[PDB]
């Protein structure tokens, strides 16, 4: 099976389905739009994340970052007054180095996350989008930057006028990706960001048509009106789309035979099936791996139901 | 005073003569023959050493990196089987992370070393020899390799048979090492190996006749027949050169003024007079801060007497 994962939503989902699904036929497809080089290396926070969840090693308080890591040379740069961009543990920077000596040598960022993937032990397919570069920059009063600065810089407290993930049209879908298509026809879109964790994805040359030729499932980021973590409450808007399930599933419209919205929300079931897709509810506030499972076996019997 | 340094004998004499003489005064020319991008940022040990040597946090055990310093990331990368090419420190790494943004930025290696030198608190000045790139091939019966490879991966046990200093013929001597001639008159050449320490800074285009206008006072690296520390044993003989002080200044007989070596060897002051230098004998076996002490004292006075 195929997943397409960005932020903390769908990890939290995988942490769940790698319960209930032999971990080898797991295909990850991560986002690569929020890879920025800090401090001479290659930091690909949504890969990362998915390679420590694997690897049991995932911070599960803040959901990125290892457990229980050390911040020696992130320490010593504050002391002397300078800001490394986000909080670098020590044990997080090998993996930046480790990717990164291979990219110096020549391979590409899908080879360094597949030697990672051996190091780490590591049996499921974790694959980057694009072995291209794709940079999100978000559109505010204060200016443009990028996600890194208004999320973690600016604590995402900017107004957002719009999105601009730039690179994307000119990035090409990872060969090995492409190859996991061709042998897969399940892919599952986990509750994150539509705009910035998952439409990088599906904003690739060639992936919408190539979803329109699978079994598409996806799980509501929003629980009501709001996401339950993200800046998907700003984001969103300025793009266009109605904050709410409804939204999320007319921004897949093109392509999702099967949507899963939250209990609570309690919606118009006969409204969906007019977008084009049958929708079912369940819970998906995962606020425990064993909610996690839950819902992951829910999204497995869709699947398997017709 | 100008002193050249490289190696750890010309640091620990730095240590003595730090403690004899207002610091504003002591300009440091640093080697960068050495320098290489490990990880993702510029390592210039040479220039590191001295840093932390005028900001009380060198470490006195091995005479290189930081004090008590910590390993984190170091010690990731070994579990997995990753060695980066040597010990690097977390507190170290600031460093090279600090510089090489810096560089990244568009800056040269002396604005980094002026930035690292403010952070820092040093009132010497630490200026590199050159803000071009120099890299010390050796030349061994197994092939040809950085000098760290030869040093510090192979532990210096191949059989040495050429040394080669890539790029000094097409390096300049840094404007702010030009600035600082104009000014000085004393120039002093600490106790380090004279091929690859010492060696590229006076290899550069012009020194040598630079040198020539002024008083120069050399300390002998080798006492007897071999040196204190390090490969200058092999070095040496690897460029046609006798291992013993008067090998020593026959190599830099060309602008040597005054030339002290150790008292364990009491050569004929005839054949020095020969070579154009006054020379005098000291203990240069620097075994603690009051021996250097000692030691910078005698060359003060080298000065001095003229
Ligand atoms: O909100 C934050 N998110 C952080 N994230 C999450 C995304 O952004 C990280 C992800 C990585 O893979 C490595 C380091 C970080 C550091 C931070 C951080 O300091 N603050
Ligand atoms: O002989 C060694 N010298 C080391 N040196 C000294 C030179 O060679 C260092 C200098 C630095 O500035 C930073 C790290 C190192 C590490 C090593 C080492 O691991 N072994």
């Given at each position: 099976?195929?997943?397409?994962?960005?932020?903390?939503?769908?990890?939290?989902?995988?942490?769940?389905?790698?319960?209930?699904?032999?971990?080898?036929?797991?295909?990850?497809?991560?986002?690569?739009?929020?890879?920025?080089?800090?401090?001479?290396?290659?930091?690909?926070?949504?890969?990362?994340?998915?390679?420590?969840?694997?690897?049991?090693q995932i911070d599960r308080k803040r959901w990125?970052?290892?457990?229980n890591d050390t911040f020696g040379t992130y320490?010593?740069?504050?002391?002397?007054?300078?800001?490394?961009?986000?909080?670098?543990?020590?044990?997080?920077?090998?993996?930046?180095?480790?990717?990164?000596?291979?990219?110096?040598?020549?391979?590409?960022?899908?080879?360094?996350?597949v030697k990672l993937s051996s190091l780490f032990?590591?049996?499921?397919?974790?694959?980057?989008?694009?072995?291209?570069?794709?940079?999100?920059?978000?559109?505010?009063?204060?200016?443009?930057?990028?996600?890194?600065?208004?999320?973690?810089?600016?604590?995402?407290?900017?107004?957002?006028?719009?999105?601009?993930?730039?690179?994307?049209?000119?990035?090409?879908?990872?060969?090995?990706?492409?190859?996991?298509?061709?042998?897969?026809?399940?892919?599952?879109?986990?509750?994150?960001?539509?705009?910035?964790?998952?439409?990088?994805?599906?904003?690739?040359?060639?992936?919408?048509?190539?979803?329109?030729?699978?079994?598409?499932?996806?799980?509501?980021?929003?629980?009501?009106?709001?996401?339950?973590?993200?800046?998907?409450?700003?984001?969103?808007?300025?793009?266009?789309?109605?904050?709410?399930?409804?939204?999320?599933?007319?921004?897949?419209?093109?392509?999702?035979?099967?949507?899963?919205?939250?209990?609570?929300?309690?919606?118009?079931?006969?409204?969906?099936?007019?977008?084009?897709?049958?929708?079912?509810?369940?819970?998906?506030?995962?606020?425990?791996?064993?909610?996690?499972?839950?819902?992951?076996?829910?999204?497995?019997?869709?699947?398997?139901?017709?």
């Amino acid at each position: 099976m195929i997943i397409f994962s960005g932020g903390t939503g769908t990890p939290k989902l995988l942490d769940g389905l790698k319960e209930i699904l032999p971990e080898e036929e797991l295909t990850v497809v991560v986002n690569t739009a929020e890879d920025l080089w800090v401090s001479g290396n290659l930091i690909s926070p949504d890969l990362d994340t998915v390679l420590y969840l694997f690897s049991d090693q995932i911070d599960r308080k803040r959901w990125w970052g290892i457990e229980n890591d050390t911040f020696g040379t992130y320490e010593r740069m504050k002391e002397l007054g300078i800001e490394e961009g986000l909080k670098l543990g020590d044990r997080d920077r090998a993996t930046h180095i480790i990717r990164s000596n291979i990219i110096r040598d020549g391979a590409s960022l899908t080879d360094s996350t597949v030697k990672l993937s051996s190091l780490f032990g590591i049996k499921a397919n974790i694959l980057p989008m694009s072995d291209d570069p794709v940079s999100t920059y978000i559109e505010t009063a204060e200016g443009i930057m990028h996600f890194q600065d208004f999320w973690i810089g600016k604590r995402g407290e900017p107004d957002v006028r719009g999105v601009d993930i730039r690179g994307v049209s000119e990035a090409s879908i990872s060969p090995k990706v492409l190859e996991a298509f061709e042998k897969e026809e399940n892919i599952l879109i986990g509750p994150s960001n539509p705009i910035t964790s998952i439409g990088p994805i599906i904003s690739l040359p060639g992936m919408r048509e190539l979803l329109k030729k699978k079994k598409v499932v996806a799980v509501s980021p929003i629980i009501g009106n709001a996401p339950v973590s993200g800046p998907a409450g700003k984001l969103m808007p300025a793009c266009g789309i109605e904050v709410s399930s409804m939204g999320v599933a007319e921004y897949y419209q093109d392509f999702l035979d099967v949507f899963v919205f939250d209990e609570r929300d309690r919606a118009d079931e006969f409204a969906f099936e007019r977008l084009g897709c049958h929708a079912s509810r369940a819970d998906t506030l995962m606020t425990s791996t064993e909610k996690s499972k839950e819902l992951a076996e829910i999204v497995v019997q869709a699947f398997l139901e017709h």
